[PDB]
Amino acid sequence: GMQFHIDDMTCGGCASTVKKTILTLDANATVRTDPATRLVDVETSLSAEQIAAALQKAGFPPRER
Ligand SMILES: [Au+]
Structure with a gap:
């Protein structure tokens, strides 16, 4: 989470x-x-860095919270 x-x-x-x-x-x-809140909550077996990398490539760079 x-x-x-x-x-x-x-x-x-x-x-x-x-x-x-x-x-x-x-x-x-x-x-x-x-x-x-511009918050995105994710449950996944992938890592936080894998999710963030995908979001960045899509044009939606995140900050982990
Ligand atoms: Au969903």
């Missing part, structure tokens, strides 16, 4: 693209996004 803040997750369709990116990397992951 890992959490990221994504400051760029504000535009139309951005939270969808975040979730879709993570589910494409790990189809068994659980992903919650909150537009009020």
